[PDB]
Amino acid sequence: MDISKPVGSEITSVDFGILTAKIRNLSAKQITNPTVLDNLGHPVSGGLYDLALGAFLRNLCSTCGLDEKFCPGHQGHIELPVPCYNPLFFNQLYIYL
Amino acid sequence: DRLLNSSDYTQASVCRECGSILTTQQSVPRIGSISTVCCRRCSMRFEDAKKGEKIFIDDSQIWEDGQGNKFVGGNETTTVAIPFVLKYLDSELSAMGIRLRYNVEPK
Amino acid sequence: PEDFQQHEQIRRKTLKEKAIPKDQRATTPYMTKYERARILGTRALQISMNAPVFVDLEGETDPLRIAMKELAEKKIPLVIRRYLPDGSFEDWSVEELIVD
Amino acid sequence: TLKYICAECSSKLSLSRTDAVRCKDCGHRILLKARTKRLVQFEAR
Amino acid sequence: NLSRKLVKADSFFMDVLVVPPTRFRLPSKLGEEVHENSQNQLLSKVLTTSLLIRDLNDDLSKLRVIFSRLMNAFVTIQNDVNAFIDSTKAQGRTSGKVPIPGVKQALEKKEGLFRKHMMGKRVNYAARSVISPDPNIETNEIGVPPVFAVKLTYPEPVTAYNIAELRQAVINGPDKWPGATQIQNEDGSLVSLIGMSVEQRKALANQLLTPSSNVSTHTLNKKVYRHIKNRDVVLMNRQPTLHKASMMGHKVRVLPNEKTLRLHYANTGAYNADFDGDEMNMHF
Amino acid sequence: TTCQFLTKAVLDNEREQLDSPSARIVVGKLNNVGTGSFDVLAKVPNA
Amino acid sequence: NENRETARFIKKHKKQVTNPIDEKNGTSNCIVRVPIALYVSLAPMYLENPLQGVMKQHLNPLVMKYNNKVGGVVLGYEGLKILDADPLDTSEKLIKITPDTPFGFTWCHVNLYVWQPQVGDVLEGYIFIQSASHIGLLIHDAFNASIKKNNIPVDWTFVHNDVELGHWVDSNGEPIDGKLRFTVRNVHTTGRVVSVDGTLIS
Amino acid sequence: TFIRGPICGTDNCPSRLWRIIDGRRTCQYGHVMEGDVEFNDDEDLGAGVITRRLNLTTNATGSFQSSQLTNSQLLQQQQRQSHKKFKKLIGHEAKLL
Amino acid sequence: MMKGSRRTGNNTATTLNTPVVIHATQLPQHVSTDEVLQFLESFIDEKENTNLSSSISQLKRIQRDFKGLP
Amino acid sequence: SAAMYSRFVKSALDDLDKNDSTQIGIIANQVALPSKNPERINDKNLNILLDILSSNINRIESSRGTFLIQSIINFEKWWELPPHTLSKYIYFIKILCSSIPKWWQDVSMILVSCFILPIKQTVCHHDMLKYFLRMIPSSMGFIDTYLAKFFPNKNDTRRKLVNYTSNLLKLRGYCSELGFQIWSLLIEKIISIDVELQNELDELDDDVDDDDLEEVDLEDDDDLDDIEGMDGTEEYNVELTQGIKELSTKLDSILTLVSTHVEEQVTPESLESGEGVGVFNTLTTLFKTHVLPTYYTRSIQYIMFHVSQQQLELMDSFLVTLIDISFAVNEAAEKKIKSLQYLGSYIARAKKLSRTQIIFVASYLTSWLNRYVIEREEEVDQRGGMERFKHFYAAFQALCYIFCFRHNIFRDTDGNWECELDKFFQRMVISKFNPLKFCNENVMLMFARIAQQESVAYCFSIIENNNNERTRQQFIDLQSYFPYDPLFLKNYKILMKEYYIEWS
Amino acid sequence: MYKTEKVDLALNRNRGDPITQHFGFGNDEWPKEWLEKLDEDGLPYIGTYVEEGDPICAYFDDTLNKTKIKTYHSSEPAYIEEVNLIGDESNKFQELQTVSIKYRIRRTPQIGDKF
Numbered sequence A: 001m002d003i004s005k006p007v008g009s010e011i012t013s014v015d016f017g018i019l020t021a022k023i024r025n026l027s028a029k030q031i032t033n034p035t036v037l038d039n040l041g042h043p044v045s046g047g048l049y050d051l052a053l054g055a056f057l058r059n060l061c062s063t064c065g066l067d068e069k070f071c072p073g074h075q076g077h078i079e080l081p082v083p084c085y086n087p088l089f090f091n092q093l094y095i096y097l
Numbered sequence B: 001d002r003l004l005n006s007s008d009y010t011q012a013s014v015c016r017e018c019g020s021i022l023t024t025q026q027s028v029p030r031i032g033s034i035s036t037v038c039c040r041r042c043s044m045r046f047e048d049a050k051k052g053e054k055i056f057i058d059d060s061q062i063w064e065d066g067q068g069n070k071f072v073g074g075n076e077t078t079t080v081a082i083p084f085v086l087k088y089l090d091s092e093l094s095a096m097g098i099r100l101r102y103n104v105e106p107k
Numbered sequence C: 001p002e003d004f005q006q007h008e009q010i011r012r013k014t015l016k017e018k019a020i021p022k023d024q025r026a027t028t029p030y031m032t033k034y035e036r037a038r039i040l041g042t043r044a045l046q047i048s049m050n051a052p053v054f055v056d057l058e059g060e061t062d063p064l065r066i067a068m069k070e071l072a073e074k075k076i077p078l079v080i081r082r083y084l085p086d087g088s089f090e091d092w093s094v095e096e097l098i099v100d
Numbered sequence D: 001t002l003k004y005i006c007a008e009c010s011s012k013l014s015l016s017r018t019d020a021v022r023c024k025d026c027g028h029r030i031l032l033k034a035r036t037k038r039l040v041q042f043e044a045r
Numbered sequence E: 001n002l003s004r005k006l007v008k009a010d011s012f013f014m015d016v017l018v019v020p021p022t023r024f025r026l027p028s029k030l031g032e033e034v035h036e037n038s039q040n041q042l043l044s045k046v047l048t049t050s051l052l053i054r055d056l057n058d059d060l061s062k063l064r065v066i067f068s069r070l071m072n073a074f075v076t077i078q079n080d081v082n083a084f085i086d087s088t089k090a091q092g093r094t095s096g097k098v099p100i101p102g103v104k105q106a107l108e109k110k111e112g113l114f115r116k117h118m119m120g121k122r123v124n125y126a127a128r129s130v131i132s133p134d135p136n137i138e139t140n141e142i143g144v145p146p147v148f149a150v151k152l153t154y155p156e157p158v159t160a161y162n163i164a165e166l167r168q169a170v171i172n173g174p175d176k177w178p179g180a181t182q183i184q185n186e187d188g189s190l191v192s193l194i195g196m197s198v199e200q201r202k203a204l205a206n207q208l209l210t211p212s213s214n215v216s217t218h219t220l221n222k223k224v225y226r227h228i229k230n231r232d233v234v235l236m237n238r239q240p241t242l243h244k245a246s247m248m249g250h251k252v253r254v255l256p257n258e259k260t261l262r263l264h265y266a267n268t269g270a271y272n273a274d275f276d277g278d279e280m281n282m283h284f
Numbered sequence F: 001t002t003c004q005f006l007t008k009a010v011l012d013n014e015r016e017q018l019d020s021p022s023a024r025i026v027v028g029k030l031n032n033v034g035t036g037s038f039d040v041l042a043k044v045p046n047a
Numbered sequence G: 001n002e003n004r005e006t007a008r009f010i011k012k013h014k015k016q017v018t019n020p021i022d023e024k025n026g027t028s029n030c031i032v033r034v035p036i037a038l039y040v041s042l043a044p045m046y047l048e049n050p051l052q053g054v055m056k057q058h059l060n061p062l063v064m065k066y067n068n069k070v071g072g073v074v075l076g077y078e079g080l081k082i083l084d085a086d087p088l089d090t091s092e093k094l095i096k097i098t099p100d101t102p103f104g105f106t107w108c109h110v111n112l113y114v115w116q117p118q119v120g121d122v123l124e125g126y127i128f129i130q131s132a133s134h135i136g137l138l139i140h141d142a143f144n145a146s147i148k149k150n151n152i153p154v155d156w157t158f159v160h161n162d163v164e165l166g167h168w169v170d171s172n173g174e175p176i177d178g179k180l181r182f183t184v185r186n187v188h189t190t191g192r193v194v195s196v197d198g199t200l201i202s
Numbered sequence H: 001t002f003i004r005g006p007i008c009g010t011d012n013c014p015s016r017l018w019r020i021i022d023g024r025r026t027c028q029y030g031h032v033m034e035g036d037v038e039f040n041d042d043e044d045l046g047a048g049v050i051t052r053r054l055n056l057t058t059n060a061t062g063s064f065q066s067s068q069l070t071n072s073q074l075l076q077q078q079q080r081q082s083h084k085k086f087k088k089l090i091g092h093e094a095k096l097l
Numbered sequence I: 001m002m003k004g005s006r007r008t009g010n011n012t013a014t015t016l017n018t019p020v021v022i023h024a025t026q027l028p029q030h031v032s033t034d035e036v037l038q039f040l041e042s043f044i045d046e047k048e049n050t051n052l053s054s055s056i057s058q059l060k061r062i063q064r065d066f067k068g069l070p
Numbered sequence J: 001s002a003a004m005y006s007r008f009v010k011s012a013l014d015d016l017d018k019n020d021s022t023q024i025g026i027i028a029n030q031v032a033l034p035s036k037n038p039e040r041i042n043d044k045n046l047n048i049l050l051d052i053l054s055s056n057i058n059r060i061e062s063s064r065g066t067f068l069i070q071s072i073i074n075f076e077k078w079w080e081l082p083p084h085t086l087s088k089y090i091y092f093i094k095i096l097c098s099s100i101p102k103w104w105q106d107v108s109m110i111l112v113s114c115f116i117l118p119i120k121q122t123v124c125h126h127d128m129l130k131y132f133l134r135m136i137p138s139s140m141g142f143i144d145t146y147l148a149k150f151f152p153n154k155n156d157t158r159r160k161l162v163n164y165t166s167n168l169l170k171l172r173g174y175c176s177e178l179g180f181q182i183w184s185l186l187i188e189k190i191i192s193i194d195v196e197l198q199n200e201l202d203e204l205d206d207d208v209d210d211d212d213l214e215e216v217d218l219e220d221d222d223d224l225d226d227i228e229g230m231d232g233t234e235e236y237n238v239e240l241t242q243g244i245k246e247l248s249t250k251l252d253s254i255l256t257l258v259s260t261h262v263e264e265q266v267t268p269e270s271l272e273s274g275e276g277v278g279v280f281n282t283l284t285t286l287f288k289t290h291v292l293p294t295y296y297t298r299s300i301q302y303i304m305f306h307v308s309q310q311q312l313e314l315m316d317s318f319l320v321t322l323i324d325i326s327f328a329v330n331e332a333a334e335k336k337i338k339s340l341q342y343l344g345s346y347i348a349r350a351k352k353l354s355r356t357q358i359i360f361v362a363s364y365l366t367s368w369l370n371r372y373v374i375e376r377e378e379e380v381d382q383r384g385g386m387e388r389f390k391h392f393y394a395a396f397q398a399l400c401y402i403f404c405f406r407h408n409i410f411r412d413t414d415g416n417w418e419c420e421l422d423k424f425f426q427r428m429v430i431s432k433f434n435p436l437k438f439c440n441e442n443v444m445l446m447f448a449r450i451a452q453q454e455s456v457a458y459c460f461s462i463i464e465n466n467n468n469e470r471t472r473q474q475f476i477d478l479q480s481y482f483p484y485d486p487l488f489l490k491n492y493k494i495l496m497k498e499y500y501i502e503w504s
Numbered sequence K: 001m002y003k004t005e006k007v008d009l010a011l012n013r014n015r016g017d018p019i020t021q022h023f024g025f026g027n028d029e030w031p032k033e034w035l036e037k038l039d040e041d042g043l044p045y046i047g048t049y050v051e052e053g054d055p056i057c058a059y060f061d062d063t064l065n066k067t068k069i070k071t072y073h074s075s076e077p078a079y080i081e082e083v084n085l086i087g088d089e090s091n092k093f094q095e096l097q098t099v100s101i102k103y104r105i106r107r108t109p110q111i112g113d114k115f
């Protein structure tokens, strides 16, 4: 903490919810490539270590435009070709079925 | 002091529309401009123009990432003071599909 | 400007219903040892950030000891806001609280 | 001269390169390094 | 539901996963050997079955046994998305001592994430040492070794009443005890004092009240990170903390020539302390 | 049983009001017991 | 449907108060007055003098720059009023000190005087330079505006000072003086400079 | 005793820096860098299982740069024929020798 | 190159510096030329008892424009 | 044969309308070569390129024509052109940054960053700087953040700190609005140099370097002419050579160049017509805020000692502005004791002072002290130490220091004393405060040996009885800081000889 | 207190993988000041005061083409007591790749010692 850096806005309450399929507006990456490295160890684009998910291995980030020191990282989505359910809510969809 | 101010105190950015930690982004501007912090899912992309009898954007609602994608809207952010594990908590609940919404009521 | 005119006016009216007037306030006339610890914490944190001091700091170099002298002369310009558990509150100034 | 000591028969010895770790006299595979004239300082405490 | 939105049944179903960012998915390493992240081992497995069912869908595009492989894919694309979220809810091979515990077991244990990393944390500006007895300090004090004393610091803001103390603290520097170790300017940038001579340190010490000519930071002032002095405060605790008197506030008394924390006998009843190899933590 | 109660709150659309001390340390808000059960306000002299 | 879903999109980009022309001339009225509400910090050093603090911290960096939330360039402020955190005008108000820092946040009202040009507005200004690429003007002796070539009519010629510059002469054989009248096409929030993109077409 | 990595600023020099508390990094003249994360882990042969065999190795204060192929190998695949002596190829000089 | 570091300082928009929120609280209402002249007389004289003296000069080119001639 | 090359850029100009940006990436690359690389552009092909852009900039403004503007902006060494190629390049910037004033954001990054060059080298850098400050009035606000951004580092060479400041003094002339900012940027960055020089300097005994032939060192540098992926981990021998003799001439070169400039700017006509008062206001309101809260610092307060001593008007707004500091009620203690310290040594060490201003000071002082002994003698014998009266003890030293260096002023033909000094000092020395014991030992014994020779008051018996009868440490160290002690700067002292009184 | 450390250079190498790294120094690729603690064979002089950070033996590896020295990392300063260099029996006629080094840590009675 610094006492010379005040914060004006504070959190008062936390709502719980479910992310719906508007992840598409959120994440515009669509991680498809199952290969995570290559030869020469570089991140292959479309893989899990893609450079639009944050800076990595002394690369600038694709979306953040910042190095590892200042990027937050960003979330990527995997398209599932079918609606696989959620094992959190499974015992409760099994009751409404 | 022993659990926030001297362990993992991070001043993070939060959108005051969707109430989220991880959807914010600082844009990749012109080199003759200033970057600002913008939400992603509150921002609608610039290939969603729909139509004083007409609309036109005030040139400051439009921001870009380094991928080149323009986005309209997605502003209304501010900075809060959270522990850093609450970022790691939020991301490891998104991987379960769970959305935490934060209400930043002193604004 | 249509929403904010009403959303403010709801907020300042809700905040007036929870303010307890000075003749109706019912809590203790004493400073309750946590009010005393936070007043000296908050005042010393203001003194160290160049707030104007209202006491002769007679060669004292400690911000926490400066506020302990302003508290003895009733010179701290702070206000305790005591929240009752439904959110309503009483405003007690530091000058009118008895100090243990 | 950098030297070693055979650990079985106490015969002094030195090895350079393409030289097996063995005693020339017996054939002992364990060699212990000898100490040469080199300054170390101590407080007498 | 003031937003009056509809409870939809696709809240139970996942048409997309989301992947945590790169910072939250760094590769693990032990010894000096980099491994691949555990979160990525059971996530590309979802991303191969996303591709196995994708080529197998093209066989349906030209039109038995291909459905026996298609229904086999729907079990494992469920049994892998079950493994990214839990680890006992996806049984799979059932061979015992299952690795990659999934994003639930990261949240649930004695360790978990809540207990080990939210409810309790590890802290900066703390110390610990074996304690020793002392009848010659006060009963409310603690005897701090000079090893601890020139390491723990306090961010003192510089003002018109402490500039006499804080000049000498910058002049003494990181080795003489009533000293300092960093100054922080009004733009938040830190200036370390470790390599400097007394001339660079007397240069900095005579500039603590000089206003930087900015307009964004005319409110702020500098901060000297002074060492821990005799007027400072310390929370001491014997570690099994049964009651709140086992974590009390002591006054600092910096004692030369000593290598352990040093405590009065009147404090040994409250900490359940005997001086036989016990340690106490010192939070500043 | 962390995710067990978490499922019970997501199905319930629950607004955590952040007033128990375990909920305040998670979000980093100041605790409401002792020195956090009141506010301090500075009385400023000019209109 | 999508006829009331898009109200959270389309209503957000519609500027409310258009600019009317004045004295039956044609030049629009762009200097407007807007009342706002600020949520600002207050220093511990301005705690004996709270209004001078709000002026020197938050209001003075805001003048003569473009602000997003008013759509114009802030020319000044009149009637700054700290909202009291004690409902009960009075001299001794009180603001709320944050728990971690010694800084106090409060609400304030003030009336801005922002300058608000829109499309189709008609502005005046003295011509600063002119070339065979554009004309450049200063609106109210302070605001940059460039009328580029693809918005100037075809039938005008650029006379050439043959050694060192030169007039942009219209179809009438008139070298144009300073005071020009042109219509706004676009307004720029490019950098830290506000520039009006204008036309001369009908 | 300085170790490499990224470049340096603090208005002087692109070089290697001086870390102060093994994860906090300073410059050579007393100006501070930001957030070294200092990858460490605890040991509970145990702690799961030795899963696979993959050749990735730390040599550059953190992520992998060692155990990378075909970059230091060209002058190593020819040292056998050149450095050792008396190769027995001597046919006509042996008529002279 | 040197515009690309100290980029939190190149943001330069802390909570001490810029307000937290600004909301328009009514509809903006147009003033006349007779009133901006009476405003800018008051606003410039009040700030002539720092910063802002690089922006008063921009106002004094605005003030002179409404009642005179370059 | 220069026309076919002028058709290649005009054929390239509509290729963004073909939407490729292909041949532009070889044209625009070709002009941004370094200025030692002979495949750059020349003055023929530049004027070929320039006026294709000065007439048809309507489509370079696109999102892909942007890059060639960068190469025109970062066309390095650009002031080295002949005037039929230079004044056409100056004509291009005056229209590019007026067509699209998104580029005045970016071009002024180059204009301020070349103020390192001398005055005669940047006649064009200041012409473009004067001009857009009239054209874009909203550029005082962010070119200001370019002045402090491109100020050079202190441990660099010496030509940058003497010539970046000299081109910056050109700025204050043709840039009246940006004035209080110029002096705040300089005075704050002299102290970075002034402060590291006294702690490199010896004691109060004068230091001589025994150098009869001084070092001109005009030739002290080279000629003005101006990796492999990783490096490998390295070792010691940073070898920071300290500012022993370098930072003595850094403060010679700069602080002489400052007071040369203000010798012009205050004059008996700018005190009426220009802003000769305005330079005196922008330094006095920079005196009591910047240099007056510094410790242990010679060599900077000679500037106000040199400005005020020009004209007699400037003493009547600095001998009373110093009393605005040194006798107030709203101010803290150590501001007042350091300013009463400034009081006695300004009046004693300034030759151009008139005697109409000496007893203008020395009567207000004796009026304060005699009013003090009236109200507060009965607070001596009570509870409390003698540290309650640090103000009185500082003022009594501030009075006796005047008498040590200006005693022949207080006489007349008769030998009388103004303000009754033999009646004053015989009364105040023997008071219950006893101001001989709690003041500076060297200057109160200096006073004893003089006021016996002047036969004003006798105090050796009390000095003898005080040291037979006999925190505090930093209070004595204000009483030992004489601000206008003589100088270390070997070149700035020469102009002070006309102004500064020596020890005898 | 005495402590032995086994410095081993066959710990990573497969049985089929030939010999990569060698005790000693590699020429023309040189950090100095390692020669205050270490000897020509890349082994420490015995009797030498070491601290944490100090080099405890040097080696030259063929792959990275570098001169690499192992570092002693313990908070207790020690002296090199004995250096045994271990020959091989199974794979005969091969060069030196196993060295055990014994330290001694002197332990005067400190405050806190239990008698």
Ligand SMILES: [Zn+2]
Pocket (backbone or CB within 6 Å): H009, H010, H011, H012, H027, H028, H029, H030, H031
């Ligand atoms: Zn540096």
